[PDB]
From a paper:
Bacteriophage Casadabanvirus JBD30, from the order Caudoviricetes, is a temperate phage that infects the bacterium Pseudomonas aeruginosa. The virion of bacteriophage JBD30 is composed of an icosahedral capsid, long flexible non-contractile tail, and a baseplate. Using its baseplate, JBD30 attaches to Pseudomonas aeruginosa via the bacterial type IV pilus, whose subsequent retraction brings the phage to the bacterial cell surface.
The baseplate of JBD30 is terminated by a tripod formed by three trimers of receptor binding proteins (gp54). The C-terminus of the baseplate hub protein docks into the centre of an α-helical bundle that each receptor binding protein contributes one α-helix to. The knee domain extends from the thigh domain, then bends back in an antiparallel β-sheet and ends in a short α-helix. The C-terminal foot domain of the receptor binding protein has the overall shape of a wedge, which is composed of a central β-sheet flanked by an α-helical spur. Aromatic residues of two adjacent foot domains form a hydrophobic cleft suitable for sugar binding. Therefore, we speculate that the foot domain of the JBD30 receptor binding protein recognizes and binds the host cell lipopolysaccharide O-antigen.
Residue numbers in the entry:
A (entry chain B), B (entry chain B), C (entry chain B): 10 to 382
Amino acid sequence: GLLINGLPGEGHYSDLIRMWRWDDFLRQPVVKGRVATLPTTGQAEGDTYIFTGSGSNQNRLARWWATGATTAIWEYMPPRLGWRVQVANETTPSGQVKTYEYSGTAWVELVGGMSDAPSDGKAYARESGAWTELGSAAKSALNVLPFMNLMPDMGRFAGTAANPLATMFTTSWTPSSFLNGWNGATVADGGKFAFDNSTNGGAGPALNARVQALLAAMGRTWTSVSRYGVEFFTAVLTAGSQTTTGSAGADGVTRYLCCSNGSKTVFNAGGWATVVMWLRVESGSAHISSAPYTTHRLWINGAVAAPGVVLPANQWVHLRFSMQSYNGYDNACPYIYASAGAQIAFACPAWFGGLVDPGIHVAPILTINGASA
Amino acid sequence: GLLINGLPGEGHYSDLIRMWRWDDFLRQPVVKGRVATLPTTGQAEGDTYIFTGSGSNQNRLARWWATGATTAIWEYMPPRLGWRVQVANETTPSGQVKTYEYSGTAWVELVGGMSDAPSDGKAYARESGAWTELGSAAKSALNVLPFMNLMPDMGRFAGTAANPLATMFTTSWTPSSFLNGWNGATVADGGKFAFDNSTNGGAGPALNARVQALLAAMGRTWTSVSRYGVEFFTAVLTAGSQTTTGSAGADGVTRYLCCSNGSKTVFNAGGWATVVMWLRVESGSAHISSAPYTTHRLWINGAVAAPGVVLPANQWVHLRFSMQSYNGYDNACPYIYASAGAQIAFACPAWFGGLVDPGIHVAPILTINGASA
Amino acid sequence: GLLINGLPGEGHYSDLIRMWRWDDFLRQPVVKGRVATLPTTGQAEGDTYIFTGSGSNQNRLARWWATGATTAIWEYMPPRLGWRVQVANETTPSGQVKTYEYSGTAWVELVGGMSDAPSDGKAYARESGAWTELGSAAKSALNVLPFMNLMPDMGRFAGTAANPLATMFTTSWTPSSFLNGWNGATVADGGKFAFDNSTNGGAGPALNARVQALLAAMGRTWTSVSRYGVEFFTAVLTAGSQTTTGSAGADGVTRYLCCSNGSKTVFNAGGWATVVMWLRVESGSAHISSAPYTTHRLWINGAVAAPGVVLPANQWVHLRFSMQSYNGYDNACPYIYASAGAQIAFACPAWFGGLVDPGIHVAPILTINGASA
């Protein structure tokens, strides 16, 4: 509380000049900026800086009154539990004039908001100008959802008669129908990982260089996850001498298709497909696709990639190629071309009948068959 | 910057009347509306229109001062880098008085908002007055998710021994256990689509009128999707002469159930069920359900529908009937009644053990069995 | 519209004191609070209460002017289609000074909001300071999604040769490979529920006390869901006399593992696992886990629970233990320890290869096998 009313009439003229000088200021209370020191030069009528220098005169106004004036002075305005003040020069990207609403102790930003979600445990999203509750599926991620694999043998190259539910298998190596050679390509066994193996202090088979390279790429370096694990076979495909179905990669190098799926019945869900598999180049060079065609999206170890990217030689890379095709089927779905004589290592393929996001997997996803018991 | 202070005292009275006339206006700066021309009639004290007519006097105030006045004039107020001004007459639906905050060049709407999502790649939804991050599953749609089909033969009417993973099959027509006749209804083979068929320039079997009608309904008119595709059989069910389990449709016409599922063990997931199948009426009439009972929701080619709707005769329609039942089982789940002697064409049924949204499918969804290799 | 301009100069001094007393008030129009009666005591200069007592003087200001005054009076300010007025003392939790914007008929809260979702049917969530559309999966819940079960026999203890798709089975009791005894534990048949049973007016087998206890726990008390249902066997595991793998519960009582899964290949999806099963304690005591280890989350009939909670004796409880393990496999996954000689009743187990939320299930989730036709 404060007053400037009353006072002898003898001095009314001083206070009357005084009140006119504010009534002139009150047109729009906008400050050009906050200052800890009175501008000693370059100020005129209409210049208002917030004199917040250390002392009792913090936040006091510092309007300079020279134009149309007898003697210019730094007229002061102590605030008192002040409130919203607009600022013109700087502004938010959304076109809002900056406002420091002085809450009485600090310069606070203006506050709004015409909607708060009811506190009843449901998440609400904006819909047609109204907030609508969301379901539980919104919060759950996709890397953990247990979707069904379409491969009967899990890519272990042991045959469908092997139980996918068992940790260990005794069946020998077996070719998979999901990987058919193309252009004369030859597929041969590359290696196998055994439970309780001897390389890490056991009595089983030993691990060959390719498997250590994979596991180091997998991050499974700890005994609990490196000395134990599920069994499976690896294979190495040698590109044939045939030169059918040519294609060029992102680097402009021509290559030919080496493997095919045998026209599997996967393109059903909106034409959507997903292929995830682990590979490494032992010799030669290869790329993905031919050129950007239709819709496509490639992730390499969780990093988006473009068509034709030449995978670095002798490194394990996680690929996830998801695209859409209403044709209902395709034989060369992978769209992978490699140079003749290239030795490509690959292990644990996984295919899905739609767009799914399991992340960087570490083992094939299970299914159910007659031998699954 | 501007000033009206000073000036000889001789004329102080003019400016003093002047400042009083504003101090009267400053009670609440609300404009009745924007005008490009001064109102030549129908204005009085308290009427304030924004004179924005073309010229230098844009945005100048146009308050008319007649009540309690000697001679009324259009007193002018040039703004200068102006700011928020409230408006009373019109208002937003949410009870907010309209505000054109003049940004110095244009009349801008007031701006607020007390929450912005952190720029770290996560989507945030409002929860109990706070923004909570959402999962990846929120963004993905439902028409592409590869869920597991419950039919062993894919509705191809070829038997479970046929591989659902193959594009082509050689097994002959075979009845499906998922469609059991009711009220004496007879189910007979209707047709088959063959890969590399001869109708579109091949050497295989030809396509009969029903299959062209379906495909035209399917939108598969292009050679890539019309001259090729997966094989499957069609069947036509002729309603029997029995009159058990009567029911009336939306048009008030009584009909009887014709087919049953044989009490399949589908009602497990919260009692939820989903049936999707493609059909066409060759003769007679039929409807869906008996009357609105329990919870129910029908889509016809993506368009919601009510119970008892009489499907148009001789057109292919996509139905998706999802409901809930805690009983754990039901034989007449479809709740479809047709007139006696009606010839109903149907192809590619698909059932699911819950509420799923695959859209307008084009082929049955695959499963895995012993013959799937 | 109103005016206080003009009037004879003789009385100019009264109105001039008058206008000064407002020009003093207009520094910041903040009211200390609304009052239906003028404060008869404890008021001074700067105290402004909204006199809203019943009568024509509603909303009129009640500023008391005593400091620096000749005679203090309750100066009145009728509003007219008023607008936003800030309030200092009380405030919103978000630091916003309370504002009752008088809409001319009622004291209305201030209104903002710089974003409304386009009215085109899509739900929008905030992302990096912008609203991004969400997918359909966001709205759908998780309790209804038809995910694939990993048990070949559905936990009916009838063998994999039994069809899971049929409501009724004739095969006798059969042990399940998914529940292997530990520490010498013995598993024996406990009971079976038969379709069209005689206990509820049929001709089939009768129901034993354990099954009524379960069903009453299930809420299936109605004839439609109590007199009918799917068939399955129950078993009772008697803990053995061996004392290997000790562990203590939340109450500090030591117990030993009684059953194991035989190292099933379930830990694939991000290492995520889900186990849901229905059990009741007939004798002894048991608890969950050993102590809080790694990540873990237990729901008991939809209510979250902590490790080591001793389940109440002789009550049916729904458990859902979901955890993560990158090891790829585990034999004692359940981590359940029971006292020696404890008689534990259990029925309808369900396991999943990831985090899933089917709610409180009433029957095992189906799968597909060679005998599923």
